[PDB]
Design a protein around this ligand. Structure first.
Ligand SMILES: *[C@@H]1O[C@H](CO)[C@@H](O[C@@H]2O[C@H](CO)[C@@H](O)[C@H](O)[C@H]2NC(C)=O)[C@H](O)[C@H]1NC(C)=O
Ligand SMILES: *[C@@H]1O[C@H](CO)[C@@H](O[C@@H]2O[C@H](CO)[C@@H](O)[C@H](O)[C@H]2NC(C)=O)[C@H](O)[C@H]1NC(C)=O
Ligand SMILES: *[C@@H]1O[C@H](CO)[C@@H](O[C@@H]2O[C@H](CO)[C@@H](O)[C@H](O)[C@H]2NC(C)=O)[C@H](O)[C@H]1NC(C)=O
Ligand SMILES: *[C@@H]1O[C@H](CO)[C@@H](O[C@@H]2O[C@H](CO)[C@@H](O)[C@H](O)[C@H]2NC(C)=O)[C@H](O)[C@H]1NC(C)=O
Ligand SMILES: *[C@@H]1O[C@H](CO)[C@@H](O[C@@H]2O[C@H](CO)[C@@H](O)[C@H](O)[C@H]2NC(C)=O)[C@H](O)[C@H]1NC(C)=O
Ligand SMILES: *[C@@H]1O[C@H](CO)[C@@H](O[C@@H]2O[C@H](CO)[C@@H](O)[C@H](O)[C@H]2NC(C)=O)[C@H](O)[C@H]1NC(C)=O
Ligand SMILES: *[C@@H]1O[C@H](CO)[C@@H](O[C@@H]2O[C@H](CO)[C@@H](O)[C@H](O)[C@H]2NC(C)=O)[C@H](O)[C@H]1NC(C)=O
Ligand SMILES: *[C@@H]1O[C@H](CO)[C@@H](O[C@@H]2O[C@H](CO)[C@@H](O)[C@H](O)[C@H]2NC(C)=O)[C@H](O)[C@H]1NC(C)=O
Ligand SMILES: *[C@@H]1O[C@H](CO)[C@@H](O[C@@H]2O[C@H](CO)[C@@H](O)[C@H](O)[C@H]2NC(C)=O)[C@H](O)[C@H]1NC(C)=O
Ligand SMILES: *[C@@H]1O[C@H](CO)[C@@H](O)[C@H](O)[C@H]1NC(C)=O
Ligand SMILES: *[C@@H]1O[C@H](CO)[C@@H](O)[C@H](O)[C@H]1NC(C)=O
Ligand SMILES: *[C@@H]1O[C@H](CO)[C@@H](O)[C@H](O)[C@H]1NC(C)=O
Lengths: 431, 162, 197
């Protein structure tokens, strides 16, 4: 297998590459939050309606209590996981009736009034794409417990988080929700990743168009790919498979003449029936313990995933994160939560530099026997003239005392080049 | 042991019994009359007791999990049938979780749909901002477990003693 | 308040109690006491009875060890999180949201607790917010001025620039604004004077 496409970076002592354009990239992160909550009646599963089997089962002690307690702990844990991931705001925020956000379109992620479920189109797609076995599982004393938070309430929590982030930015996470215009919020996010406000304001229509296109692409990508939602479905599959296996284990002789307790009682006297029932009880008990052990390991894995999901919700949705690759590929701008069955989907809106151009670079500029260093940018040359520009976007500006600071003489610095540094005061005093 | 309902399943003439995906009997053919019956096991439920602290009160409510109310202050929930609690249209924070958005509290014991949060509408506009004019220094507590009790077991003594 | 630590202590005690309880289980044998089995039976059948007791007790002990290992993994994860909080909240100021308390994190204090650590998170919460009219940029002399570090606010008649997280209005000057481009490109720009020092 090929690891990667081969790229050689053109490193040289005096050359730098500066981006001249950007792409607004929205990426999907799917995280499982909770599992199916399962409760097992130990006596009914191992013995059914047989009194003699229950009497023999009592000799083993508090195994049944241990299994029930472990399942109860997992069941409460799933509800706790859902609360931790989604119930992070105590105020249910609502969007303004006029959905104008400076050209940004949030229709795909905001709740749809037309639908009865009050879910977003992306959320509706997520629910559709994630899906007498159940009757048999119920008949064998295994019961699925309803989630404490219903899907509509989880959708309501996601809607509140979306409304808070869109109307108030990151303020609602850290305190009272403070309204801010969405272009100003996007400008603040641009400042967070080291790009000036002017770049966002001048290119606002382009950025809005790119964001809308990216959101549409995300919806198409989820709709057109079967394996996009694989993780959540896998969790659902495992739970069903585990229950099916446990039900299947009732059909195992376990070294006894028959797998049916009623046949064993009907055909044999109690001294040997006790032995056969004992073999069935030990096999079924071993199967149930094995099922509980796998459930506990899966519960730990889901709890870790839920803790990660809660961390992403706090750091990517309620704030702008400087952590690399935590909130999408690229420089993170903002994130949107979407409810999914047993899961959360994060739409990470990130800034990706593009259309980079080569420039000649210097560490410092020597003017009047003094070394000038950029306050916030980098020195670039297009071949004949020197300018100072911001690192993450190409915006050449004249080198002045305002945007440079003087430390030391030129000689100490290595690689310094000679260029003029303009003085703003010089025309004013001159004229 | 099961209920025998009418069956729509068309058995082949040789077949006598029917089985589920999970190898559990779901159908049978009567020997006396050649008709097909759907064997369905009798209803079962998980009886759960909802109670406040004993010292505060001795009132209890019973939840039959997965059981419709007609097959057992009676209210029907997705979780099951709740007996001994009165549904209230008001919404409060969850005190005792019943499930499916239903929570119970003691005030008699009442059951209600839990309120997610207080409703707040943010006054978003194209050209208005809200600026804080004051601050609160808030100290909050976070409790994290670090270690457990260290336990050693003598395997020989525990299993066999002397 | 201290439910989590006590819960861990409770589980450990409960697990030991259950394991101790398992000694009183016959496990399909005539008696649960080994001494009675030795005192009452010959070695060919006593061996069978002891075998039944051994298999039941061994299964109980293995079950206890398996739960202990799962709990140990959970506690190890919690301890790793606690160490991360101690490094990032107590030994540094964290910009991660909700990692070190609700609100903007300032500092944290560690307190020892039985089997645990309690973090006192000191955070800054904004309060007493006030509405203002805002603009992206100020148009002066055919040039667009943008705030270096703040936001432009208006109280109804006058424009000022203030820091985002506290209201401190200041006169709009060349010192706290930077010029990029003409006014026309920016959407929503308003006309106001920009003072020159
Ligand atoms: C910056 O300049 C370097 C070299 O002047 C460019 O690197 C060359 O890229 C071409 C096309 O990929 C290769 O065929 C050459 O072998 C590369 N040269 C070296 C020395 O690596 C680079 O492409 C330029 N950057 C941009 C954005 O055009
Ligand atoms: C930066 O990239 C954007 C696209 O990402 C460019 O916008 C395109 O401009 C061309 C020609 O003006 C149009 O035909 C396309 O339809 C535009 N695309 C979009 C999505 O609007 C933009 O011109 C680039 N700017 C620079 C300076 O290179
Ligand atoms: C926001 O985007 C939505 C869809 O992404 C736009 O709705 C489309 O509007 C066109 C024109 O009326 C219709 O032909 C499409 O069928 C609509 N799509 C859907 C999914 O309904 C909407 O116009 C955009 N703008 C605003 C302001 O909401
Ligand atoms: C480097 O950039 C500078 C500034 O953008 C260029 O100088 C201008 O070039 C244009 C076109 O040649 C002239 O019309 C202007 O009068 C020039 N301005 C000044 C102040 O001289 C310069 O040409 C660029 N160099 C290269 C090699 O592209
Ligand atoms: C950068 O500027 C300094 C000062 O103008 C240059 O130093 C002068 O170099 C010339 C020629 O080598 C000498 O005749 C002068 O006596 C030097 N002056 C001083 C004060 O040292 C320096 O050479 C320039 N460097 C480059 C690369 O152009
Ligand atoms: C900022 O102004 C807006 C509207 O001018 C205020 O929003 C109103 O708040 C009252 C009191 O809660 C509600 O009854 C109104 O329905 C709200 N109006 C709208 C359009 O939502 C807001 O409270 C003001 N903010 C501050 C801090 O005073
Ligand atoms: C900011 O809030 C603080 C309290 O958090 C205010 O301090 C209070 O001021 C009132 C009247 O001046 C006193 O009666 C209280 O005793 C003060 N409380 C404390 C804790 O000192 C302060 O006045 C507020 N400032 C502004 C400008 O609103
Ligand atoms: C907005 O703030 C400015 C500055 O505080 C206010 O201007 C001052 O208002 C006071 C009281 O009205 C006068 O005594 C001063 O002479 C004003 N200063 C100047 C330079 O004119 C302004 O009134 C405020 N506007 C509103 C609507 O409250
Ligand atoms: C902001 O200032 C500019 C320039 O002072 C205004 O543009 C002028 O508007 C008047 C009336 O519409 C025209 O007669 C002039 O020809 C315009 N001059 C230029 C250079 O465009 C602009 O209208 C002002 N904006 C606001 C909102 O007051
Ligand atoms: C600059 O780089 C080249 C190779 O990239 C190297 O040969 C040269 O020595 C470097 N310049 C200095 C002053 O070291
Ligand atoms: C058995 O008896 C029933 C009732 O008289 C009759 O309908 C049926 O044809 C008989 N034969 C078989 C093979 O069931
Ligand atoms: C400003 O906002 C209002 C409602 O929030 C909207 O009706 C209006 O169209 C907006 N202005 C522009 C230019 O879009």
């Amino acid at each position: 297998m090929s690891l990667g496409a081969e790229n050689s970076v053109a490193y040289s002592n005096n050359s730098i590459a500066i981006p001249t354009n950007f792409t607004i990239s929205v990426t999907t992160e799917i995280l499982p939050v909770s599992m199916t909550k399962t409760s097992v009646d130990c006596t009914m599963y191992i013995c059914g309606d047989s009194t003699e089997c229950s009497n023999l089962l009592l000799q083993y002690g508090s195994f049944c209590t241990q299994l029930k307690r472990a399942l109860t702990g997992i069941a409460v844990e799933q509800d706790k996981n859902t609360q931790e991931v989604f119930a992070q705001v105590k105020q249910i925020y609502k969007t303004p009736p006029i959905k104008y956000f400076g050209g940004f379109n949030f229709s795909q992620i905001l709740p749809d009034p037309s639908k009865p479920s009050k879910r977003s189109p992306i959320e509706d797609l997520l629910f559709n794409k994630v899906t007498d076995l159940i009757c048999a599982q119920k008949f064998n004393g295994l019961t699925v417990l309803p989630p404490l938070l219903t899907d509509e309430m989880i959708a309501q929590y996601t809607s509140a988080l979306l409304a808070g982030t869109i109307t108030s930015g990151w303020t609602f996470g850290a305190g009272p929700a403070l309204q801010i215009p969405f272009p100003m919020q996007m400008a603040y996010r641009f400042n967070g990743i080291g790009v000036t406000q002017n770049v966002l304001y001048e290119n606002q229509k382009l950025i809005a168009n790119q964001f809308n296109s990216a959101i549409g692409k995300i919806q198409d990508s989820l709709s057109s790919t079967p394996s996009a939602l694989g993780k959540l479905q896998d969790v659902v599959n495992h739970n069903a498979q585990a229950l099916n296996t446990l039900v299947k284990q009732l059909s195992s002789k376990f070294g006894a003449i028959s797998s049916v307790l009623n046949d064993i009682l009907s055909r044999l006297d109690p001294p040997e029936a006790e032995v056969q029932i004992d073999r069935l009880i030990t096999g079924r008990l071993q199967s149930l313990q094995t099922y509980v052990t796998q459930q506990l390991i899966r519960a730990a894995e889901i709890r870790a995933s839920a803790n990660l999901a809660a961390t992403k919700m706090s750091e990517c949705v309620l704030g702008q994160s400087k952590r690399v690759d935590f909130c999408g590929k690229g420089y993170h701008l903002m994130s949107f939560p979407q409810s999914a069955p047993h899961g959360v989907v994060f739409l990470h809106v990130t800034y990706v530099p593009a259309q980079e151009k080569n420039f000649t670079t210097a560490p410092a500029i020597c003017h009047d026997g003094k070394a000038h260093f950029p306050r916030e940018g980098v020195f670039v040359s297009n071949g004949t003239h020197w300018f100072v520009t911001q690192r993450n976007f190409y915006e050449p500006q004249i080198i002045t005392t305002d945007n440079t600071f003087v430390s030391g003489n030129c000689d100490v610095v290595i690689g310094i080049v000679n260029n003029t540094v303009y003085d703003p005061l010089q025309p004013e005093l001159d004229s | 042991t099961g209920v025998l309902t009418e069956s729509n399943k068309k058995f082949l003439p040789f077949q006598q019994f029917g089985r589920d995906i999970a190898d559990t009997t779901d159908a049978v053919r009567d020997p006396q009359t050649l008709e097909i019956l759907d064997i369905t096991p009798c209803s079962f439920g998980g009886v759960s007791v909802i109670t406040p602290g004993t010292n505060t009160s001795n009132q209890v409510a019973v939840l039959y999990q997965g059981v419709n109310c007609t097959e057992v202050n009676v209210f029907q929930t997705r979780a099951g049938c709740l007996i001994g609690a009165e549904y209230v249209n008001n919404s409060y924070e969850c005190d005792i979780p019943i499930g499916a958005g239903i929570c119970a509290s003691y005030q008699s014991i009442i059951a209600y749909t839990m309120s997610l949060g207080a409703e707040n509408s943010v006054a978003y506009s194209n050209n208005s901002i809200a600026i804080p004019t004051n601050f609160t220094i808030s100290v909050t507590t976070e409790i994290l477990p670090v270690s457990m009790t260290k336990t050693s077991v003598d395997c020989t003594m525990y299993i066999c003693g002397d």
